[PDB]
Amino acid sequence: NRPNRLIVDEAINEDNSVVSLSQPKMDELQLFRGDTVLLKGKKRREAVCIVLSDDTCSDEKIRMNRVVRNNLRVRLGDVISIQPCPDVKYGKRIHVLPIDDTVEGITGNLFEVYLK
Amino acid sequence: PYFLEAYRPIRKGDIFLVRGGMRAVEFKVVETDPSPYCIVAPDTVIHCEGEPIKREDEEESLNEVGYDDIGGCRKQLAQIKEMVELPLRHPALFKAIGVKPPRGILLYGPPGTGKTLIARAVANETGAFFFLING
Ligand SMILES: Nc1ncnc2c1ncn2[C@@H]1O[C@H](COP(=O)(O)OP(=O)(O)OP(O)(O)=S)[C@@H](O)[C@H]1O
């Protein structure tokens, strides 16, 4: 009987790293709207996001985007554990690579147009 | 009557066209003695005796149909050029954009108003491959 197992509903916000929660569930769960949470999913795959608040969100349901939903191997109506983690530090080198199907038309630059 | 008070600038290897006498006729400027290009003056003796030669297989003929054989439908021919010319001129660029082109264009009108002609002219002038299915 834990208050951290939550179930995915449809997203309203448009960002790729924002999850939403209702305010009494955050106050029970000891979360503030600037925190940096850790999210576990099926096949032991986990994700990291920024939480914010909502009133249209219920307590038994969390609202997350499709990009987070596909990086956790989760579909609509499945179970995900959330936990606070302020153990996140900054970085030095981050290595990114495009995926082969979406980059067959354009050639030239990719840093200043997209990532900047 | 063609070169009289004209002084047409010609070059070696060009095909030109003359109308008159219920027939159009082609010629090719084969050889100039001040090589290669000149202006036809009354000084020039013009050799018009010999055998009419064969074509090269990539010489675009003048009995084909182009946009100058169509009259009276300026607006519609402008619309068909706007729909069709860009996806057939630049296939790679237009695939690289990510917009869909049109794919079905239905021409309609009364019988005898030149629909087969318009399709044939757009096909010749863009240089695309052209397959004709008849009903
Ligand atoms: N706008 C036009 N400008 C010049 N010649 C035209 C024009 N419309 C028709 N013609 C002449 O009319 C001939 C017959 O036109 P078609 O292309 O056969 O018209 P059509 O759309 O084929 O009519 P149907 O229904 O197929 S019989 C053409 O070969 C041209 O000689």
Ligand SMILES: [Mg+2]
């Ligand atoms: Mg016809």
